[PDB]
Every structure is written in C-alpha cells, then in structure tokens.
Ligand binder design. Structure first.
Ligand code: FAD
Ligand code: FAD
Lengths: 593, 593
C-alpha cells in the first residue's frame, strides 16, 4: 500500500521526511472527536501541513466527542464514560509524547501520564460484589473449566474470515458464561452475548499480554482528570498553537464522491452551518477525513428527577455515513451498526456526585481506600454480579474535574441490561431518573433501605445519559461492513475512528481512533515512516505460555492434564522429547513446568 | 534488580524522572570507546548528572576506541574495520535519536542515518567470488542440508548454560561447514571454527529476523562516513556541549575495590597521566564505569612497504582487567579472552586506497556499481571463497573520509586465516607489507598477473594493522567469565562493553556497548524507565516460520519432508488437525503451505 507496519525503536524514534507536495494540500476532518484531532496532529507533526489549511468541522458546540466530561448547566457533573488505557496503545503513545502537558512545564501528555501511573499505580482491591455489598468469594479466580478454555482457543484458532455475523453465543457454551472470566470480560469491555464473536476474538488476541492483570485491573492506566481535560484540551491547545481552524455547529450532511472505474475523489462537502445550507468544493489536493458513525451520537440527558429520554434518532453522524454508503458499497454498511440494536442493550450511564459521608464511607468499606484521598479509589469498575441490571460502577481519582469541590466524589455507573426491572427500583434503567439509578446502586452497596431514598434524592445529584448507539461498535459484522481507512483507489478520502477497517486491532478503544487517524494521514500523504503494528503479543511464545498458565488459574502442565490420560500420555511423551532442552527451561520459566 | 526490561512505544517515548540524589554524584569512565561515550550520554540525558562531574579517562590521544577512522600521518587512510548495523539495535537507536547530527541542522544522528539508508538502501550484487574474479555459482542459496539445519536448531534448542567452553566445531558436522550459509555467516560476523558455540547460538537467535537478508546484505545499514566521523564525533560534540571532561593519555592501571561480605565499593583509581603516577580517590557517590578488555588493544600499524609488526603485548586494557580480576572472581576471567589465542586467528586488516582506474574498473566489473558514484559499492564484504587466507573485502560509500579526494576509493580487507601462505603471495598475511596484501587481493579480483605488482606498489597505498585481540570477543567462554554489568552488591562499580555480561544480546556489536552502557547507568542511578529488551524475534512465531522457509531455501512444508516418510506421515496428520484453522492461514501466509 501507501504505508508499511514496523515495530521497535528505529522506526519509533525516526522522523519522516516532509512528504511530497504537501505545501499544496489542505485537510478537512469531519467531527472533532479523538480520531479527527489525532489525524490533525499527525498532519501538523509528520505531514508538516500548514495549520491554517486544516479545517475541523464539528456539529456540537465543543470538541472531543465521546471523550467528554463537563459540569453540564442546570444538571451536574457528567462523564459519558471513563477511559481504561494500557501501555501497548502503540499509536496513541506515539501521538501524545508530542502533545505538551497543560500542567507540567516542559513535559508531554505521555510524560505526565507515565509518571502519574507510576506514582499511583492502578489496581482493584475489590472487583465483584453481590448480596448487597459482599465481595464475591472467588474474586480473582477465572473459574473457567477446561471446556470453556478450549472454546476460548477454538475461537482464536478460527479465521477472522469465518466469523462473519457470528455472535458470541454462537461459539461459547454454558461453562464459559458461568465463569468469573466472563464477568470480568463482559463488564470491563461492555460485551453483550449477542455481540460480534469476531471482535471478541480480536480482543482475546489483542490483550493476551494482560490476562494476569484482568481480575485486579493492574494492567490498566488512567489519566489525571476526565479525558476531556487530560486528552482533548492538550490536543486542542497544540492544534490551536499551530493555526488549525475549528468550526463548530457545522453539520456535514453529505460528501459528493466520484467513484469511477479508476478513482474515488471527494468533490464537495455539503454542510449546514447553523441552519443555513452551504458547500465546500474540493480538489484532489483537499483531503477529507470522515469519522463515520458514532457511539455517542443522539445522546440525551436526564437529571436527578428526570430520566434521560430514550431516542432512536439518526443524528448527523449516522445520516452522513448512510449518505456516503449510498455512493459505494466500499464505504461500509452503517445499518449493521445503527439498526436493530436490541432493547436489552446498554443504553444508560450515570454520574452520581455526592459529598455525603455515609455514601463515601460505604464506598470506602467496599473498595478499602479513601475516595477523597486524591488517588486510586476503585481501581476500575466494581461489578454487582447479582444485579438485575448487570450494573457496574467506578470511582476514578478524585476529583475528576479540576473545578470540582475537594469534598465531593463523582461515581460513574452503567448497566448492561436496559429492559429489566431493578432489584430495589422495580423498573428498567431507561425508565429511571438520576435519583432512582442512584437508589438502585445504593441498595447494592448495602446501604440501609431506611436511608436509600433520602441519600439519593437529597444527598446526591445523579445525571443519567441515554446513548442509543453506545453498543454500536460490537454489533455482529461481516468483513466489508466497515470501510478501509483508505478505500481502494481513493485519492483524497479516508475513513477514521472505530467504524473504519484495519487489521487485528480492537474497537471501543482510543488506540483505534489514533491508529486509524495515523494510517489515513500516512497513506494519503505517503509519509515515509513506519506505522507501529498492533503489539505482537499473540505471536509471542512467552506471552502464549503465560496465558496458558493464567487461564488455567495458575496450574502447571501436569496439573492441567491431571485427569485426562489421553492428554497425560502425550505430555509424558512431550516431556521425554524436551527434557534438558531450552524448551523445558522456557516452560519452567513461565511456570508451566 | 535496579532495572527492568520493556518494549513498545510507551517506554520508548517516556522520559525518566530525575533520579534520586544524582546532584551529589560524579562519574568516571575508563576508556573513551563507544561504551563509555554512550554511558556518559545516558548520564547527561537520563541521569541529568552535571557534565563537569563526568570524567572520561582515555589512554590514547583521541576518543572512539574501536570506532576509529583517520588519515594516519606518514601512512595513509586507515579503517581498523567497518560497522554493519541493523534496525533492531534497540538501545543504540534510543541513544542516537538524542545526538545532534553534525551535517543536517535540526536533525539527529538517527534521522540522518535513517534517511540515508532509505535514499541509498544497502544490498550486495555479488557476495562470494572464486577462481580469480568469478561469482560463486550458488551465490544466494544457503546450500544447507537437512542435517545441517537440524544441527542449527539443536544448538538453539541447547540451554546457554550447557555450552560452557563448547566450540563451534563441537556442535556442527561436515554438511554445515560445507554450506554457503557458513560462508556468509563466518565472514560477515568473523566467526572462527574454534570460537564459542554459545555466542554463535546467541547470534542465530539474535538476528533470526534477518535470515532472508543474509546472503545479499539487504538487512544491513551503514553510516555516511567512517564510524569515527559519523558516530564518535557527534557524541563528543554533544558531550562537550554539556561540559563533560575528557582526559587523554591517561592510563588506568588499577582500581582499588573493597569486596566485603555485604558490599563492593570502588575506592581509588590508580592512573598514569603521561609518565607520572597519580590517584583519584572515590566516595560511594563517585561512579566508576570500566570498559573491561578490548579487541583493538595493542594494535600495530605497517605501511605500503612494511608489515604491521605482530605483537602479544598486554596493553593497559587487558592489564587493567587482570588487576581487577585479582580482586574478585565476580569481576571476570580476562585470560579466557586474551590468552591462548590461536595463531591461525584473524589478526590483520588493511585499508587499500587507490585512484587508479584499472583497479577501480575491475571492482566495478565484480560489484556492478561505480565505486566513485558516492553510493553503495559492494553493499558489504565480498568473500573470496577459495582464497587461502579466507580473505574478504568491502568498499563502503565513497569517500568514507570527508577530507578524501573525490577520485579515490579506500578498500577495507581482512583475512580469517593468519598462518597460511597466500595463493599469489606465498606468505601468511602477518608476514606481508601493505602492498603484498594488496597484491594478493588484486590477484583474486582477476587482475592480470603482469600488472599486479605495479598496481599494488605504485598505484595504491595499503596500510595494514595487526590486532592481537580482534577475535577476543568470540573465544570459548563459560558463564561467569564475564562480569555482570553491575556485579552483585556493587554500589558504584559497573562494567560496560562487549566483555560484560548481559542476557541474550550478541557481542562484536556496537549495540552491545550501548546496551551495557545503558544498563549500567540505569542500575547505578536507579533510573525509573524501562530498558528495551533484545528484540523479541526468536520468540515470535511469525519470524520462526519465516526462518524455516528461508533456511530450507524457500521450500514449503511438503517439499521439506518430501523424502522422509516418518516425517511426511506426521505432516499429513498435522495438516488434518489444522485445515480450515488460523494456523493453516498463518502457515500459508509465511509460505510454509
Ligand atoms: C462511555 C464510554 C466509555 C469508553 N471507555 C473507553 C475506555 O475505557 N477505553 C478506551 O480505550 N476507549 C473508551 N471509549 C472509546 C473512546 O472514547 C472512543 O472510541 C473515541 O472517543 C472515539 O472517537 P472518534 O473520534 O473515533 O469518534 P467519536 O468520539 O464518536 O466522535 C465523533 C465526533 O464527531 C462529531 N460528528 C459526528 N457526526 C458528525 C457530522 N455528520 N458532522 C459533524 N460532526 C459530526 C460528533 O459531534 C463527535 O464530536 C469509551 C467511549 C464511551 C462512550
Ligand atoms: C575491525 C572491527 C570491525 C567491527 N565491525 C563491527 C560491525 O560491523 N558491527 C558492529 O556492530 N560492531 C562492529 N565492531 C565492534 C565495535 O566497533 C566495538 O564493539 C565497539 O567499538 C566497542 O567499544 P567499547 O567502547 O566497548 O570498547 P573499545 O572500542 O574496545 O574501546 C576501548 C577504549 O578504551 C580505551 N582503554 C582501554 N583500556 C584502557 C585503560 N586501561 N585505561 C585507559 N583507557 C583505556 C582504549 O584506548 C579504547 O579507546 C567492529 C570492531 C572492529 C575492531
């Protein structure tokens, strides 16, 4: 193609030559989420494109998209969701080592993040609770049977090309869905049983190097504040310092694209700049980066006394992608992702803010840390295993908002099941006000029922959010439902974000938006530098040995095959062949012998 | 330990916090070769130690050590040797992305190197010649038998701990030593048959990712000029710009070190600053970095009419290490490396400089490129397979010296066998003047015998070098013959360079001197940043598949087991199990099916 994949320090530390003819080129980016902001950064840093020639078109009043986090007027503090990150976000760390921190002088976002997560390393002291505040007895074990582990491996051993439209329930049976592994997995990643087995396979291979840090979240890393303040604003400042044009309340309705037998060229961007319909006409030297689709599109907000009103509106993002899909099948199949979403699916998240000491003290007694100490609190989500909603909640380092009073915590809450009565509040989450969500949560923390209503109604402000498309990334798909980052024969059109198509990597991650942004800029501008591949961990023998050990809850190879002689016989035969060799040493080194 | 290994961009791009109490610390570095210069750079950049507190002590009049390259007065142009490098010199590229280029403004040594090797990618058009100038018929094939390949794998499958004092001839039989593979291997890496099987195993695993670029040198990368001008001088300028003290003609005779039951502390450096004997007394906050041993120590130089005089002098480097070994067995076993070196071993290298058109035209006719064009010429060494000396020669990009006339080439020549009469000059190389080495070389290029003596004597200036210890890295060794980079309980003493002990990596490489330098600085100062591991290629399934394909001269798995039914039966059984799975896809992707 117009790019190549690499790994290692040589390509990481190298600077690309200024790409050819970039002086006569411009860039239009549809949306101002993380993908578009990352594409613009690469355009500045590695494309050496003029800032004033880069135009970011956003339909909302501000930037960031799904990376939001704000004190919403007449409502309260809101996080549409948190962001778990990890060391092997290979592209995203390439980007943010070049973004100046807004807190620490002469340091980058990576530096401040790197130091913070060493000062205050993330881990969970309590991962799963049940029976109104009691820690799950087996918390920390995966409780996978040998049958469940085999299905996990059969899935990874399945070609991606054979998982078209296959569901997670099509490839796993009873034992797996009964495991603690599935509890940790489905909740930390927001998988539903009807979601894409293809994506879940991508996930099993993508984070295999962190399976030992799965139950305790010790592989997770977190920014200092919410992702708007810690990621979006550093990017915007950097971009603004280079003269990049930001255009808000501009809704891209369509892009007219010539798809001939030899070329795809974007010709005109049909926009609605606040009520009025206008156009931007393009040449071949005007590059268009489309964030196609969005999980946060058409979001509604409730308040402490009002449910967030459910909706099925196709907003601008999904109507744009549909209008583009009308012009070539190579531009993807939006309806696979925005249509026929089950009403059981996750729709609602809520931010519960309180300074009340009974609430805060109850959270301390479950998570074993002071929620107001300024460090890790829950270390990630706590899952209420036996909750009807399949609800989970987390308290990040407090306060997640620079402007927030230092005696308040904000708790983020979400529910995997949206069409089921709660256990204390006898309604589905979609039917619930802020305070009713809070009440159902407080009940599962063991708060005395005598106090739940008053603590929720009067000692807390809880803002709910209804997101019709929050599960849209994971909908069952076929190869081809997502456009290439640079479709075949495209001259000036790229698709970026978590609905574009690239190899191996996992969607529902910020890394995917930076990778697609990076690959699009590199291909359209023919930048002469490698793109870091998705980390090679599933091909690494040492990581595969570790995974066998971890998946079998820390049993060596003799314990594993202990009670099946057909496999035990082969082990003895295997050990005869490898005794006194380097394979026996590696296996011992990774606790398999 | 006081360090950890990592890989990936997160650790690569991160900056370490200023280490604790570094303000009250100093550094003494014994030698000014690449290791010491690299240790000082890391001390400046990542240790944030004051430059004026860093003291580099060198016995020679200038810096660089084995990285030399100069117009030696009354002699001629000399390169003690070239430097093949590769992309996965993980530590060295970490270092040199921080070293400013002396040619390109606002660019680093890595940048200029990275760009140059893309502008002018290295490859050989002619790797092995014989019969006075004819290309080897099988050049490009490895001509390994299945028996030779099995021995290669049995070696890698042997624990390092079981190769103590084992020779290369102890683990390989006839077929291997008859292969083209061994021709390429022994000459590009300067292995002798009596050298350490342990190191050769380390080499097989270390560069397994480049086995496809072995015969044509397409994996090699080269600096613009000789390594003194392109590597040493950029470092010195950087170091000097930070106030580092350089001390020349200072010979370190001994370091007094307290080795107690609980600590090793260096107390005093006994020096000879030009004739006079002096001392430097140390506290625990004075760090000492010892480059122990040297392959270039005690080098003698001839000229066009005089042999370089053979020697067996222990110079300052080997006497220093012996004096240190007298103080603890934990400081290594110098005699394994500087004593009992076979007289057949490589001792002599020579730089032949000429502007003569018959010589230059003859080289063009073998290497197929214009030697004076300013780009790649031989792409690496050309090996004269049927030469009694087992001689090889290379012409790098010309001119290798910024000051050299643009109508001259310099050819670097070396011989693996030092005690055998040449085929045209009937003497061992050690007995030969500059011009006699040149004459023997010219004969193997097909130069008409009528012209050889005059072209060598009068149309060329050839400077020979006698290096008693040039093969010293590869001498058979046991675990323990080399000190840890930071010996157990050392407080202020580290050993650096290619005679120190670290995991997996290969000596006779510049990467090893930067890695040992990096690890020593990081351990003694407790720098809070990862050290990049030796590249994980021998654990990568995809690289192991490629190696099977390449080692079997590009045969798939059916061709390989074609004529052994005991293995063919197992293949059929293997293929039954994996058909329609992702393993079958990977194998096809890597040409094994
Ligand atoms: C609740 C939640 C939790 C998450 N947790 C994690 C996590 O733990 N770890 C992780 O790695 N990732 C997480 N993510 C994912 C990450 O936040 C998203 O993947 C990422 O922000 C996607 O960014 P994007 O730029 O690709 O698109 P989006 O974030 O969806 O942004 C699209 C933007 O474009 C604008 N736009 C859309 N259509 C149009 C149009 N037609 N015209 C003009 N403008 C338009 C929108 O206004 C929006 O600003 C989470 C996301 C959510 C919602
Ligand atoms: C001919 C040749 C070809 C090579 N080719 C390659 C190649 O292709 N690729 C590759 O990666 N590497 C190659 N190398 C290796 C690389 O050049 C060396 O590994 C590297 O330079 C070692 O540096 P060092 O600092 O570890 O020690 P040295 O280079 O040996 O330097 C030691 C220095 O310390 C000084 N010193 C020694 N003892 C004392 C003392 N007692 N007191 C004071 N000062 C002292 C010496 O004067 C010298 O300057 C080659 C080396 C040679 C000789």
């Amino acid at each position: 193609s117009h790019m190549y994949y690499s790994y290692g320090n040589y390509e990481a530390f190298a600077r690309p030559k200024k790409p050819e003819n970039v002086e006569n080129k411009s860039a239009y980016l549809i949306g101002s989420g993380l993908a578009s902001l990352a594409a613009a950064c690469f355009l500045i840093r590695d494309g050496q494109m003029e800032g004033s020639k880069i135009h970011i078109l956003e339909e909302l009043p501000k930037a960031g998209g799904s990376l939001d986090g704000e004190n919403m007027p007449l409502k309260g503090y809101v996080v549409r969701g948190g962001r778990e990150m990890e060391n092997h976000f290979e592209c995203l760390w390439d980007l943010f080592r070049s973004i100046p921190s807004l807190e620490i002088d002469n340091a980058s976002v990576l530096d401040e993040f790197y130091w913070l997560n060493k000062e205050d390393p993330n881990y969970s002291r309590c991962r799963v609770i049940e029976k109104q505040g009691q820690r799950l007895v087996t918390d920390g074990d995966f409780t996978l049977t040998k049958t469940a582990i085999k299905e996990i491996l059969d899935l990874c051993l399945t070609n991606e090309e054979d998982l078209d439209d296959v569901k997670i329930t099509d490839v796993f049976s009873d034992d797996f869905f009964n495991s603690n592994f599935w509890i940790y997995w489905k909740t930390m990643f927001a998988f539903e049983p009807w979601h894409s087995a293809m994506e879940m396979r991508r996930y099993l291979m993508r984070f295999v190097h962190h399976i030992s840090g799965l139950a305790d979240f010790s592989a997770l890393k977190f920014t200092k504040y919410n992702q708007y303040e810690s990621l979006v604003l550093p990017m915007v400042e950097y971009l603004k310092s280079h003269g990049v044009q930001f255009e808000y309340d501009v809704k891209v309705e369509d892009i007219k694209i010539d798809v001939t037998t030899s070329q795809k060229i974007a010709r005109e961007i049909l926009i609605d700049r606040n009520g009025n319909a206008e156009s931007i006409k393009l040449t071949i030297n005007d590059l268009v980066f489309v964030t196609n689709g969005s999980i946060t599109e058409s979001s509604t907000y409730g308040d402490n006394d009002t449910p967030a009103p459910p909706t099925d509106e196709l907003g601008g993002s999904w109507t744009l992608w549909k209008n583009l899909a009308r012009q070539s099948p190579e531009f993807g199949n939006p309806d696979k992702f925005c249509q026929n979403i089950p009403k059981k699916s996750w729709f609602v998240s809520a931010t519960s803010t309180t300074n009340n000491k009974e609430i805060i003290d109850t959270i301390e007694s479950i998570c074993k840390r002071d929620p107001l100490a300024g460090k890790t609190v829950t270390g990630g989500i706590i899952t209420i295993n036996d909750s009807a909603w399949q609800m989970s909640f987390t308290i990040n380092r407090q306060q997640q908002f620079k402007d927030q009073p230092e005696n308040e915590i904000s708790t983020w809450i979400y529910a995997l099941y949206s069409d089921v009565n709660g256990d204390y509040i006898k309604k589905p989450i979609t039917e619930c006000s802020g305070n009713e969500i809070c009440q159902e949560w407080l009940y599962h923390l063991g708060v005395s029922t005598d106090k739940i209503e008053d603590l929720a109604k009067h000692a807390s402000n809880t803002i709910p959010v209804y997101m019709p498309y929050i599960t849209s990334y994971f909908m069952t798909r076929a190869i081809g439902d997502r456009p290439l980052v640079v479709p075949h024969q495209s001259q000036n059109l790229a698709f970026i974000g978590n609905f574009a198509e690239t190899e191996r990597d996992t969607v529902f991650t910020t890394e995917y938006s930076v990778r697609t942004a990076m690959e699009a800029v590199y291909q359209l501008l023919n930048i002469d530098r490698g793109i870091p591949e998705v980390i090679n961990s599933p091909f690494d023998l040492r990581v595969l040995m570790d995974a066998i050990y971890e998946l079998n809850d820390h049993q060596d190879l003799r314990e594993i095959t202990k009670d099946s002689k057909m496999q035990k016989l082969a082990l003895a035969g295997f050990l005869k062949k490898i005794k006194g060799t380097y394979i026996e040493s590696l296996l011992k080194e990774h606790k398999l012998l």
